[PDB]
């Protein structure tokens, strides 16, 4: 029932552009919107966002996160590790592309999602979230090499998953860090659970 | 070690506006980044508020209130939590029994509020307070619920049990083009993983 007209180009940068979208409401009435897309896309999405279960025997499982500064924010930010899916690669490789640069573990597919929209009021970004395990008592994750590419600058933090909400309001309270949303939606809902 | 140098407007819309940003790596190096951020937060501790409603009613599974809407910056339908933005003085807690009672008709009782987390950190400043909320469905308010949406406001309800929630999302994925929103996902994911 509602669909749109026209998007009317506002500006353009290099990495993001902002565009008036005209759009028929249910009624048959015309609205506009301010809407905001990345110039990246081709792509089932924009973005992985990778779930990284860390598993070692007789240890907790932990989630293993990422700590950035974010010039949007003004501030660092925990996240689950992240990037651009390349020209031609598959949602699955680049989570474990993803990974690998930004936290040096060499993980396994679990499973992988529909493209999921990240701020649907305001963007059209969307990403795969990719759930990924990683066998922390391999050799190969003895040590874990982070290849960070140019202008990436990450810390890596992993947490018990069964406590992660706990362990996350922790930090925040005496860190000064932001917590992503989905990393907290997923704390939360591990709580929640049963 | 990194922060903000200046903040340079490029566009200003409305609602949404978009900045150059320039920073200092921790390398000591310039460099710049292009920031959204919305026009519209004043005073508050975040933008806006997203709820978690917990639906609880003697003799039934807990459900998680969704709702679907068409969303122009995506060109489609998008399932997310409730949700909307924090009205200057308003508390985070009483913009989402608020948002919740609108969207959707239920009435809520307040469970938890997150502290303020970040939308899409990679490319806005825009944040949120995550506020769980209970519903008591045996309450004779909740038995038959009316929506009270504001100007431009057309949403569906949609109920899902917990206990299934990641299945029955993709079930309404396979049915029809609309996409799920990435907090949604998370929180589903978080509850099959414990
Ligand atoms: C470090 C390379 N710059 C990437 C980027 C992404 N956006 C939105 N602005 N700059
Ligand atoms: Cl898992
Ligand atoms: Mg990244
Ligand atoms: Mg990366
Ligand atoms: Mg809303
Ligand atoms: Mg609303």
């Not at 565009?19 to 919107?33: N, S």
């Not at 999602?113 to 922390?136: E, F, K, Q, R, Y």
């Not at 982070?146 to 947490?159: M, R, T």
Request: glycine share 6%; charged share 25%; proline share 6%.
């Amino acid at each position: 029932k509602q669909y749109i007209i026209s998007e009317e180009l506002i500006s353009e940068g290099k990495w993001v552009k902002l565009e008036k979208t005209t759009y028929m409401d249910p009624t048959g009435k015309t609205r506009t919107w301010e809407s905001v897309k990345r110039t990246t896309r081709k792509q089932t999405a924009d973005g992985v966002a990778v779930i990284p279960v860390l598993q070692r025997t007789l240890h907790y499982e932990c989630i293993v996160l990422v700590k950035q500064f974010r010039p949007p924010m003004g501030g660092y930010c925990i996240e689950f590790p992240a990037g651009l899916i390349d020209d031609g690669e598959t949602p699955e490789a680049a989570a474990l592309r993803e990974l690998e640069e930004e936290t040096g573990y060499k993980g396994d597919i679990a499973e992988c999602s529909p493209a999921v929209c990240m701020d649907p009021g305001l963007s059209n970004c969307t990403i795969h979230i990719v759930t990924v395990t990683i066998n922390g008592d391999d050799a190969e994750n003895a040590r874990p090499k982070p290849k960070p590419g140019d202008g990436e600058f990450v810390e890596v933090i992993s947490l018990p998953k069964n406590d992660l909400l706990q362990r996350l309001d922790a930090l925040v309270a005496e860190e000064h860090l932001t917590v992503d949303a989905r990393v907290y939606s997923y704390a939360l809902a591990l709580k929640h659970a049963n």
